[PDB]
Amino acid sequence: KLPPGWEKAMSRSSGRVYYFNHITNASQWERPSGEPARVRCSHLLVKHSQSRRPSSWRQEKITRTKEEALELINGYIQKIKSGEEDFESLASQFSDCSSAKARGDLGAFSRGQMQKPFEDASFALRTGEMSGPVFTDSGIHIILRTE
Numbered sequence: 001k002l003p004p005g006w007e008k009a010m011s012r013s014s015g016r017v018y019y020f021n022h023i024t025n026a027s028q029w030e031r032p033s034g035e036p037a038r039v040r041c042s043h044l045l046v047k048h049s050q051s052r053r054p055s056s057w058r059q060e061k062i063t064r065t066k067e068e069a070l071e072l073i074n075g076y077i078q079k080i081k082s083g084e085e086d087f088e089s090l091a092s093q094f095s096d097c098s099s100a101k102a103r104g105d106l107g108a109f110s111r112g113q114m115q116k117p118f119e120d121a122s123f124a125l126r127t128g129e130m131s132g133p134v135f136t137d138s139g140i141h142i143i144l145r146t147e
């Protein structure tokens with residue numbers, strides 16, 4: 001059992017079992033629960049100095065380090081999981097992609113269209129699920145599967 005990518009792990013603080021997905025970098029306490037032709041996702045992208053294109057609508061020259069980008073991503077994930085802020089609101093404000101203007105929506109796509117790590121993560125998510133930090137040449141993503 002356990003859907004594609006999902007793995008059982010041991011909490012270092014609690015000793016309690018949790019579940020981690022090595023394709024999406026999602027992690028959760030609850031036990032997870034065939035791959036479709038197309039999926040629809042939104043994303044929030046945080047670029048860094050090592051991004052293939054180190055600029056965005058947010059800032060002409062992106063200078064933060066990959067490590068600093070990951071901290072931001074982790075912070076947004078915390079805000080989303082706690083309900084303090086919703087994904088769509090953070091994507092509109094903070095994503096270094098033009099899709100920010102559409103609350104992060106990329107529309108529907110099939111395999112063979114996106115960068116591979118993004119694609120694999122997108123197709124490993126079930127409808128409604130969100131990834132952890134996903135790394136591509138563009139930067140670091142949080143991905144939400146909407147369809």
Ligand SMILES: CC(=O)N[C@@H](COP(=O)(O)O)CN1CCC[C@H]1C(=O)NCCc1c[nH]c2ccccc12
Nearest residue numbers: 052053097098099106107109113114115118137138
């Ligand atoms: C371009 C964009 O809107 N954002 C990119 C910003 O990153 P750069 O500044 O380019 O490095 C980041 N993309 C979004 C997720 C992965 C990445 C990607 O693979 N784009 C290919 C675009 C693409 C190909 N067919 C699609 C079908 C639907 C939607 C998008 C696409």
